[PDB]
Design a protein around this ligand. Structure first.
Ligand SMILES: NC(=O)C1=CN([C@@H]2O[C@H](COP(=O)(O)OP(=O)(O)OC[C@H]3O[C@@H](n4cnc5c(N)ncnc54)[C@H](OP(=O)(O)O)[C@@H]3O)[C@@H](O)[C@H]2O)C=CC1
Ligand SMILES: NC(=O)C1=CN([C@@H]2O[C@H](COP(=O)(O)OP(=O)(O)OC[C@H]3O[C@@H](n4cnc5c(N)ncnc54)[C@H](OP(=O)(O)O)[C@@H]3O)[C@@H](O)[C@H]2O)C=CC1
Ligand SMILES: NC(=O)C1=CN([C@@H]2O[C@H](COP(=O)(O)OP(=O)(O)OC[C@H]3O[C@@H](n4cnc5c(N)ncnc54)[C@H](OP(=O)(O)O)[C@@H]3O)[C@@H](O)[C@H]2O)C=CC1
Ligand code: HEM
Ligand code: HEM
Ligand code: HEM
Ligand SMILES: [Cl-]
Lengths: 514, 513, 514
């Protein structure tokens, strides 16, 4: 417990072993060097049991990588609460003085396993807190916003960032064809194409929940919140050229950086802060507060400190604890809720769904995925069931025994006779839906909602001249390879962000087109 | 000849003779003797055919369905003989249409080897290969069901299957669940009557059970329920007879159907609907969206649509029946859902299990492909047999011509605040009766309770022999329940009807030694 | 202006489609942009069927990558026979005048499927010929030899080339610890550390079967053979530094090169040649002829021309036709046999074993894996069974019908009554086994057999002075990061190859270390 995470990371690990190897049934292995033949020059025999066992398990080492965020790495640590936010949330892990074990995984998005850490890309920033009321995951990114506001479009974006169907090549035309035809992408593409598209390490970047979530206090009062994880190491970014150079020198530069830092006792820290928007502020804010492509201005809603987290433990086994971790924004806990962000709501479905396939039906039972409290469930069976309920316990509720049911239920019947429980605050306390029908509709339109104002503000009001110039230079690099059909779409896109940025992008682009 | 012939021939090899080949096409030396290093020497590793043959044998089994593992089916045709175009624009239901079909029949609780004639609900699952996509009506041989909320479905199904400790099915478990979930009473009464043991798949009705929606060319909705009325007529075993046949032929109904079709005795069902005007819903005496409530045929009589006939046996049972992926979520223009929470859970659940039970690309298998071309941006996944034309885009919106949704413009992401309005293709919704996410009861209609409908069946519909057999069947099914469950069951049946309840207890006590 | 492989490459491809999209049941998709909600600001509904279907299938796009050789790419083409080799083999594809469709996949070995093509590594060179007597695969490498002579050691070598269990980092100490303690590796490590460890493209390298195989003629007479695929484009290699620079600029450099070459009509060609060792020559050759770590001298066995192959077709769909191809040395055909090469014998089991898992039980039925002749098999069922036998055909043999049995069988009974078939020449005509017992034994020891003489010969008699210096430089670079425990073991390993090479390796290593 020299990290509070020691209880978690030690789960499943064998003691150190010596002497001679054994087969998987426990019988001694004769040789790891020579296989059995019928005569020295005779054929290999079928019944070299160790040989076949060794080859067959070797043949099954690989599992499907994540889509997206295949390339990643992580660590374990502790969340420490230093402020009192109890007036906003009853979430157990956020109460005063609470110390909670965590896991984190960082990643890129588009590239596969083995792809370089320092390709220009968004970086994943995904936390698990092992709380007393269950695992609470905040699966964030190193950006406060994102490319889209509807999950229907997510697989379109991700195919466009991956490889063409015909030849397995990533493609500039495809990336820009998608982005310019999905102009809601403007805010995040501006962020991505700036310095922060190439952070040097996982330690030298902020993390964000990106989405608006909900906090609910002990008396059932909700507020809207956004999470901000502010690096104590500070933002530090490569130039476009530097990142590509590092990609060739060390494709695992960030994975290695984090390992070395923790091994050397240089434990990275982030200050945990939130923006808090009162429930009553939501409808009249200048931007739609639930549109992922819109950040809340920190002038309107400043960061409020909560505490900090520290990464102080490397994994014991990378594959077992990091590759197999199943981080999921749907892992919420009491005191935390969702919001009418359609991207978030799609995510709440999508992660567990992929994980049931990528890992297996019983992925929740793996050491790194089990919570610290006992799971009380009627789920059973499935492939590779390691853990099962006490002998003879019932498989169904309501039942005549004592296993139990939901906290809203009485534990003895099916809640018939027209029983109602009321508002599902554990999902979220909803605002006005603005309609009574199943629809495919726009988000409620707020005064300053469009696809371009916020990245325009970033360019005009936040970025210094160097940042503005590198942005244009980066963009024009990224455009190399687009078709002639795509060129004017890209010019238009950037002009819509800012006419000066757009002019400079085109200027540099034509210079390089040679 | 059958309209299903083009479907059912997909994937089938020509008959082959001569000698066998390995899976790479090379000649097999022997199917009888394996290669050894000397006649009495060890088997060699590199008998390639031996290992290939053993390894593929080792991989023949796949997860059976949960539930409805034990089943069997056929192919056929739907024929429209009436004009229902005022109610629906669904292509397959338009005047004169003839549509190829598939069907799978099944029990519910038992596993792959279990008997067809255990007392159980029977599945009645149809696929129509329409010009506008596969439309599946995944029904049962009952117009109702045990529950009104999908949250409870795995509880019911575990209670119908085996105890975790010893792998035995269990009467106490079945009745403990049924009596503590009294919404079950309508279907339990149906299940425990004669129709719990139909002799064959041909001698039972089918039903969609749920309220669905039909929408016409002008966008006007009506609520509908499907009824498939058997031309062979209901014909049921007694409790004792079904149990006897269960041991004599575990595949009684599977064999019966295959034989009937081989002999040219093609079974036929008349396809009819009940149609409830959209404006009738709120004031009907029962909640029209509660699965445990039937619509009275006195209030809404059956309206004829056409008939379907089964005239084709599968070419290969595993390939075409075990691997068929029937799914109530396979709807088509002109058909919609309803605020039935059981139905809404099913719309998710089937494709979810199928992605696992069969594979991510299960839709590409011959029996699961529609007759029209699929135009999708989905790609890759295990065992991808079918892929798009070379170089076609993987994303939309794009600058090419593959296309997008019929609501979309095909060129952009529908930003700038584009709205499409009511999602009628899902269903034209009635009043939700609230503005908040809630866990709530169904809207309460005047005669809604858990017992009135099976009581009416018993008191007003069942004849004297049916009433007595019902009590006899229930008391048989009760044998083995714990003393802690007996009084709960007595009261349950009293709630249905006091005379039924009295008779059930009387017979139960007689049989209890 | 097409290809003989067009029949293969078109299997499974849809026609071009336009209009609007459909769900997977064929019904029209309402939108690819907006998901359905209960009110514009209400929750997403569960029954957006298209949303869930699109996300769920997106979630299942990935499959396990190969272990090893995850990162690869390929093409299709034609094998043309130009010489008469019928005196040596009856194999159909090798008969005079035969033109046979082919597939090829090139690859690296260690890295995962996003990793750079131009990491220093062995490159895979794996061919499939779609012959009239089945698919014949020659799954070779760009080297005539390899690191080991026993499949028992293969998973040890491959872990040592992949990532440490604790942190997911590849590791120089691990690579050299294994190589030096398994000194049979010396031949291939010398090849790997030379110029050929970094070929510029897939087109500018030779290919080899590496193992000794067997050819059998129509009369049943065997000879031992080795396959050589000599590039008409010529060897062309990066330096160690250039290869890393390219890895950062374009991780898919070689994938892109091959695609572009074929797209442009610059079809790469290799001349197909064999070495042929008479059956009577094997026991008295100066080296063991079945030891993968021993090449046959081309002074003793010159190359004999057979024909050439040309790559003239890019895949229609990369994932469907390349990622899912199941290349397998066990795919032999009449006229071709194996040998007492233990590595080869282990491979004959291992590939189909992995493919059953990596792809699925029915992987043989996928378009790219089906032969051009009809498969007549009693195998049945299994996940995703697309193809099934004619209605009512029997599932077992011997049977009273016509489907048949093996060519040695009579088609009517089980071959009891003590029926014997004799020597299994279809596997191979074996030489003497040199013993009568199941053993774990060394290979038969030939006069000049050791772990170091052949790369010593390469260094002393083949390499030019620049090649000799680059070799020492490359080695010393690859040694950076090894522990002090490993240093003297590496110094000694290189001295065993050659005292002068050894001295220069140590010299440069100590220079670079600081
Ligand atoms: N939560 C938010 O509102 C965030 C907004 N932004 C961008 O800043 C604009 C103004 O937001 P508002 O909060 O009103 O303004 P503020 O002035 O209060 O803050 C601007 C934000 O932009 C960040 N920033 C500085 N340089 C870059 C850059 N190179 N690339 C990306 N971000 C950078 C700042 O980080 P720092 O303090 O370290 O300089 C700060 O968090 C928005 O349009 C948005 O695009 C960016 C991050 C968070
Ligand atoms: N969709 C529906 O309205 C159906 C309802 N039921 C049951 O009938 C009751 C009355 O419904 P309503 O339509 O108003 O009355 P109706 O008289 O108009 O129809 C009653 C239905 O009950 C059927 N029935 C007859 N014997 C049995 C039995 N052994 N087990 C199950 N069903 C049987 C009849 O079949 P048949 O005409 O062939 O004799 C008929 O379909 C309901 O409470 C319900 O339990 C049952 C089937 C359909
Ligand atoms: N199958 C074989 O016999 C091969 C053996 N070797 C190596 O060559 C040595 C001598 O064998 P032998 O055939 O008797 O001699 P040969 O002179 O007849 O052939 C030497 C081989 O070495 C190749 N070679 C040239 N440069 C390099 C290099 N930078 N790295 C690796 N290989 C290179 C040659 O290719 P090229 O003609 O184009 O110059 C030629 O194939 C062996 O010890 C073996 O290590 C290498 C390739 C094939
Ligand atoms: C509707 C939009 C999105 C969908 C459908 C989606 C879906 C997914 C899925 C299925 C995975 C793989 C999970 C697994 O297999 O374990 C994943 C990975 C990931 N996603 Fe999302 N995503 C979306 C948008 C976002 C957003 C907005 C963020 C950040 C706020 C985000 C952050 C991440 C991170 C960090 C990972 C990697 C987690 C890890 O390291 O294991 N994604 N996404
Ligand atoms: C919310 C409640 C229900 C859920 C979650 C559910 C779920 C399922 C699932 C996942 C399957 C297996 C599908 C497959 O693997 O191919 C199945 C089988 C089946 N279910 Fe349902 N079911 C529900 C209620 C019903 C109802 C009400 C009916 C009839 C109206 C029904 C009829 C059937 C039939 C006929 C099959 C077998 C289809 C076949 O023959 O392949 N189920 N159920
Ligand atoms: C006993 C030693 C070896 C074993 C057990 C072994 C096993 C394997 C396996 C299981 C695969 C993945 C197959 C798949 O999933 O499709 C593979 C890939 C491959 N191996 Fe081997 N291997 C061995 C040595 C060799 C040798 C000596 C060569 C060359 C002569 C070679 C060439 C290749 C190539 C080219 C691939 C990639 C094929 C492709 O591009 O799809 N391997 N190896
Ligand atoms: Cl799955």
């Amino acid at each position: 417990e020299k990290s509070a995470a020691d209880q978690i990371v030690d789960r499943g690990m064998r003691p150190k072993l010596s002497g001679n190897t054994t087969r998987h049934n426990g019988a001694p292995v004769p040789s790891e060097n020579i296989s059995a033949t019928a005569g020295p020059q005779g054929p290999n025999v079928l019944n070299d049991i160790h040989l076949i066992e060794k080859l067959a398990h070797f043949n099954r080492e690989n599992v499907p990588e994540r889509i997206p965020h295949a390339k990643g790495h992580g660590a374990f640590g502790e969340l420490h609460i230093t402020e009192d936010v109890s007036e906003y949330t009853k979430a157990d892990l956020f109460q005063p003085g609470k110390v909670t074990p965590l896991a984190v995984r960082f990643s890129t998005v588009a590239g596969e396993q083995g792809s370089p850490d320092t390709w220009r890309d968004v970086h994943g920033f995904a936390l698990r807190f092992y709380t007393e009321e269950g695992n609470y995951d905040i699966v964030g990114n190193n950006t406060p916003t994102f490319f889209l506001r509807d999950g229907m479009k997510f697989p379109d974006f991700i195919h466009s960032q991956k490889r063409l169907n015909k030849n397995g090549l990533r493609d500039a035309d495809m990336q820009w064809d998608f982005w310019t035809r999905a102009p809601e992408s403007a805010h995040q593409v501006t962020y991505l194409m700036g310095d922060r598209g190439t952070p040097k390490t996982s330690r030298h970047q902020d993390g964000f929940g990106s989405h608006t979530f909900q906090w609910i206090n002990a008396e059932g009062k909700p507020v809207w919140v956004k999470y901000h994880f502010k690096t104590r190491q500070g933002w530090d970014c490569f130039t476009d050229a530097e990142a590509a150079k590092v990609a060739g020198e060390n494709a695992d530069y960030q994975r290695e950086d984090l390992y070395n830092a923790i091994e050397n006792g240089d434990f990275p820290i982030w200050d945990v802060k939130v923006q808090i928007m009162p429930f009553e502020d939501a409808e009249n804010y200048r931007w739609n507060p639930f549109d992922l492509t819109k950040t809340w201005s920190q002038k309107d809603y400043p960061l409020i400190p909560v505490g900090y987290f520290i990464l102080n433990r490397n994994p014991r086994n990378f594959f077992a604890q990091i590759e197999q971790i199943a981080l999921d924004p749907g892992n919420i806990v009491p005191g935390v809720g969702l919001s009418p962000d359609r991207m978030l709501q799609a995510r709440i479905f999508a992660y567990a769904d992929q994980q049931r396939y990528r890992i297996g039906a019983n992925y929740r039972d793996l050491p790194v995925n089990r919570p610290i409290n006992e799971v009380n469930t009627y789920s059973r069976e499935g492939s590779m069931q390691y853990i099962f309920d006490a002998e003879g316990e019932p498989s169904y509720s309501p039942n005549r025994y004592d296993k139990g049911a939901g906290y809203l239920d009485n534990g003895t019947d099916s809640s018939s006779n027209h029983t109602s429980y009321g508002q599902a605050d554990d999902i979220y306390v909803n605002p006005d839906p603005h309609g009574t029908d199943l629809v495919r509709a726009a988000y409620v339109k707020h005064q300053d909602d469009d696809d371009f104002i916020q990245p325009g503000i970033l360019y005009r009001e936040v970025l210094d001249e160097g940042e503005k110039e590198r942005l244009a230079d980066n963009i024009s690099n990224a455009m190399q390879g687009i078709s002639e059909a795509t060129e004017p779409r890209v010019y238009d896109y950037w002009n819509n962000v800012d006419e000066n940025l757009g002019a400079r992008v085109k200027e540099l682009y034509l210079q390089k087109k040679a």
